[PDB]
Amino acid sequence: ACGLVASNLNLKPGECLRVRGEVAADAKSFLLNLGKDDNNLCLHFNPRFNAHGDVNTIVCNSKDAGAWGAEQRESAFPFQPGSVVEVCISFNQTDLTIKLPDGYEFKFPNRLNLEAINYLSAGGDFKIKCVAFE
Amino acid sequence: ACGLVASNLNLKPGECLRVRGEVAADAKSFLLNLGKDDNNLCLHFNPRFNAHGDVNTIVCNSKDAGAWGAEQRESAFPFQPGSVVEVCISFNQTDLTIKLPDGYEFKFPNRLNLEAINYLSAGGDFKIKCVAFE
Numbered sequence: 367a368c369g370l371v372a373s374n375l376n377l378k379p380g381e382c383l384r385v386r387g388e389v390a391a392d393a394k395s396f397l398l399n400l401g402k403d404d405n406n407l408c409l410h411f412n413p414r415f416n417a418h419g420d421v422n423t424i425v426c427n428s429k430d431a432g433a434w435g436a437e438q439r440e441s442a443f444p445f446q447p448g449s450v451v452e453v454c455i456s457f458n459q460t461d462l463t464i465k466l467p468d469g470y471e472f473k474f475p476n477r478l479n480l481e482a483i484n485y486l487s488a489g490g491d492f493k494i495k496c497v498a499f500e
Numbered sequence: 501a502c503g504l505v506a507s508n509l510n511l512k513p514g515e516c517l518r519v520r521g522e523v524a525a526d527a528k529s530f531l532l533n534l535g536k537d538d539n540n541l542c543l544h545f546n547p548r549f550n551a552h553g554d555v556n557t558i559v560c561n562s563k564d565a566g567a568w569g570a571e572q573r574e575s576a577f578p579f580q581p582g583s584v585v586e587v588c589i590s591f592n593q594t595d596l597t598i599k600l601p602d603g604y605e606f607k608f609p610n611r612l613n614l615e616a617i618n619y620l621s622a623g624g625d626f627k628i629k630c631v632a633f634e
């Protein structure tokens with residue numbers, strides 16, 4: 367990943383992840399990956415401003431052994447190019463719970479059945495300024 | 501013990517790296533390694549509480565191709581076992597500056613003449629709570 371890569375995390379259920387970054391003034395999409403490794407992701411958080419045929423929509427997906435899963439699209443989109451953004455991801459057993467800047471909160475099933483998150487990578491037109499564990 | 505291993509950081513001169521975390525209640529010692537990789541560190545910040553022939557003394561050192569270098573010690577030790585501490589690290593072509601929790605601030609020569617810091621690694625009796633770029 368050509369963005370931050372944090373490994374050996376050992377994040378456990380009941381633990382929260384807070385990621386604050388800065389959206390590029392000319393963003394077309396950015397992402398946050400989480401899981402065991404780049405090929406086994408419990409969550410691929412991809413807000414596409416305008417990329418891969420999407421406009422102002424969030425695409426969530428999983429990846430099991432390199433194979434992408436069935437996408438889950440969200441319409442809530444409180445993101446603007448050129449601004450500082452903060453998302454928060456809660457790890458639970460059966461699913462994850464994502465909280466956007468506007469207060470919206472949604473879920474993504476823990477399809478892989480992970481009981482600990484070890485990998486995290488940032489990508490796209492977005493630069494991380496703070497990663498906090500809690 | 502080994503915690504978060506952050507790769508792909510792109511810390512440039514003048515940019516501040518701020519780490520906040522918790523020291524174990526019975527901490528022998530804890531460390532922070534920054535550099536290009538595990539065998540090429542420009543700063544091995546290692547506050548020793550009671551270990552390696554050291555008591556309440558901060559030990560810093562570089563590490564080129566695995567070979568350690570001349571150690572350097574600091575008598576200032578604002579670390580209380582079992583507490584959330586924080587340090588800041590910025591650099592220039594001649595040396596790094598480490599700011600401790602009580603305002604104390606010292607330097608360590610940039611022996612490797614690094615142009616950017618792409619690696620970070622926590623270790624010891626230290627649980628990282630937050631990593632910020634400023």
Ligand SMILES: CC(=O)N[C@@H]1[C@@H](O)[C@H](O[C@@H]2O[C@H](CO[C@H]3O[C@H](CO)[C@@H](O)[C@H](O)[C@@H]3O[C@@H]3O[C@H](CO)[C@@H](O[C@@H]4O[C@H](CO)[C@H](O)[C@H](O)[C@H]4O)[C@H](O)[C@H]3NC(C)=O)[C@@H](O)[C@H](O[C@H]3O[C@H](CO)[C@@H](O)[C@H](O)[C@@H]3O[C@@H]3O[C@H](CO)[C@@H](O[C@@H]4O[C@H](CO)[C@H](O)[C@H](O)[C@H]4O)[C@H](O)[C@H]3NC(C)=O)[C@@H]2O)[C@@H](CO)O[C@H]1O
Pocket residue numbers: 544546552553559560561568571
């Ligand atoms: C009387 C008295 O106590 N006087 C003290 C001195 O003892 C004291 O010196 C320190 O002593 C330490 C203990 O040495 C013994 O233990 C180690 C293992 O822990 C053994 O390896 C070593 O051989 C010693 O063994 C002991 O030998 C004696 C003699 O044989 C035995 O006693 C005899 O026993 C028989 C019965 O069998 C009989 O009774 C005899 O009468 C009796 O004499 C004893 O039993 C035996 N014990 C054991 C368990 O075997 C030393 O460890 C310490 O050494 C460090 O400091 C000196 C300088 O002060 C250095 O020269 C030395 O190389 C070493 O440096 C440290 O190296 C490490 C690793 O390289 C560094 O750590 C690394 O740092 C990196 C960052 O830079 C990374 O962080 C990395 O992770 C990390 O690992 C470390 O920073 C270095 N530190 C320094 C300062 O350089 C020292 O000699 C002194 C000082 O306290 O005070 C006197 O008053």
